[PDB]
């Protein structure tokens, strides 16, 4: 898994044509007052909206309240095969747990239509505190569970967060420490 | 920051001889009975040992007990400029906190001699639970603090962990998501 500020991770998206619209989209969604930003912040709670980005890439814009205490056995632990997740928090704070799929127990085997494997919870997993402007990238080996709150951002149990989950085909996204 | 199982992250170390050399060391240290593995596991507690790997790359092999409760304001929060950290846990479990340098308050400005910026603690930062075989990679934008314990691995307060922090010159490391088009 990768995580960090979108504004520090721009170099990840340069010099590739397929990624160009995507990077533009991530920046637009974060820009206060932009069309994409206004659209995302106008989402009714517990709804989503899909935006096509070309080359098999699309964004799932969503808003919801946090559900699970970080110190609990709750949460929906999942991983994917076709797609890499680019999770961008637009407003609010979200807790994410992440663990390697080889450390997790499969509950529901891969469902191709939903591009989804479901795991038993791993409560003690790494915990990412994703505030607005932070990007978390989850690959095939990253089991992840979202919608956690911690004591410092408990208000988002009743005040919705806003985010985009960009799905990009893994065939396009090949993480390397070299170009 | 990047984190994951070393055995799931092999694809990262492709297409340069220098990354290949780095990867070879990381794998050797995890292999029970290897020269590097024995060297790391024989360290006395609270000591470290430096191993040059070529190309300006070197490993700081270390052993120590965990010091700070995760729910505390303790911890030495730092970032670097010249080097990228490859932190590999060889035995035990370690908690690491990581936060973007833009959310941290500078305490000690950059010291070029030691390649170090020191920050005020960010106790609520993301928390990485690094068990044996896990790798955390910290780049210049990643402020990080080590030696945390959580309740699920509190035994390493009294029993030492073993790890390597491999320092790679920034010029060797270019994080990319796709081929350049
Ligand atoms: Zn996902
Ligand atoms: Zn460091």
Q: Is B105 helix (H, G, I), strand (E, B) or coil?
A: coil
Q: How many residues does chain A have?
A: 179
Residue (of A159, A154, A153) closest to A134 by Cα position: A153
Q: B177 and A152 in contact by Cβ < 8 A?
A: no
Is B85 within any annotated ligand binding site?
A: yes
Residues contributing to the annotated binding site of A for Zn(2+): 78, 80, 85, 144
Tokens 């044996």, residue? Answer: B132
Residue (of B81, B141, B135, B3) closest to A127 by Cα position: B3
The alpha-helical segments, DSSP class H, found in B86-153 are none
Can you tell me the distance from the alpha carbon of A65 to that of A81, in angstroms, rounded to the nearest whole number?
27
Tokens 């409760």, residue? Answer: B69
Residue (of B132, B144, B39, B142) closest to B94 by Cα position: B132
Tokens 């350049």, residue? Answer: B180
Resolution to 1 decimal place, in Å:
1.5
Can you tell me the distance from the alpha carbon of B27 to that of B34, in angstroms, rounded to the nearest whole number?
10
Q: How many residues does chain B have?
A: 181
Q: Which one of A12, A18, A127 has the shortest CB-CB distance to B126?
A: A127
Are A124 and B150 within 8 A, CB to CB?
A: yes
End-to-end CA distance of chain A: 19
Q: B129 and A129 in contact by Cβ < 8 A?
A: no
Q: Residue A87: list chain B partners with CB under 8 A.
A: none
* Encoded tokens for A132: 């607005």
Are B163 and B47 within 8 A, CB to CB?
A: no
Q: What is the signed CA dihedral for A10, A14, A20, A22, rounded to 10 degrees?
A: -30
Q: What is the DSSP letter of A8?
A: G
Are A95 and A149 within 8 A, CB to CB?
A: yes
Q: Is the dihedral of CA B163, A175, B2, B166 positive or negative?
A: positive
Q: Going by DSSP bridges, is the β-strand pair A142-149/A68-69 parallel, antiparallel, or unpaired?
A: parallel
Q: B1 and A5 in contact by Cβ < 8 A?
A: no
Can you tell me the distance from the alpha carbon of B109 to that of B119, in angstroms, rounded to the nearest whole number?
9
Q: How far is CA B56 from the centre of its chain?
A: 17
B17 touches chain A (CB under 8 A): no
∠ CA B84-B131-B164 to the nearest 5 degrees? 40
Residue B20 backbone dihedrals phi, psi, to 5 degrees: -65, -45
Burial B48-69 (b: 16+ CB within 10 A, else e): eeebebebebbbebbbbbbebb
Are B33 and B112 within 8 A, CB to CB?
A: no
* Encoded tokens for A30: 């974060």
């Amino acid at each position: 898994a990768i995580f960090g500020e979108l504004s520090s991770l721009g170099h990840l998206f340069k010099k590739t044509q397929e990624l160009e619209i995507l990077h533009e989209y991530l920046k637009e969604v974060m820009q206060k007052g932009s069309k994409a930003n206004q659209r995302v912040l106008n989402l009714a709670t517990n709804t989503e909206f899909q935006v096509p980005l070309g080359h098999g890439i699309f964004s799932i814009e969503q808003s919801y309240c946090l559900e699970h205490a970080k110190e609990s056995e709750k949460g929906f632990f999942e991983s994917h095969k076709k797609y890499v997740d680019f999770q961008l928090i637009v407003k609010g704070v979200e807790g994410a747990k992440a663990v390697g799929i080889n450390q997790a127990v499969i509950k529901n085997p891969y469902d191709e239509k939903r591009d989804l494997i479901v795991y038993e919870p791993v409560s003690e997993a790494s915990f990412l505190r994703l505030h607005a402007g932070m990007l978390a990238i989850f690959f095939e080996n990253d089991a992840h569970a979202l919608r956690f709150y911690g004591e410092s951002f408990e208000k988002y149990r009743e005040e919705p967060i806003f985010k985009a989950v960009v799905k990009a085909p893994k065939g396009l996204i090949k993480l390397k420490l070299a170009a």
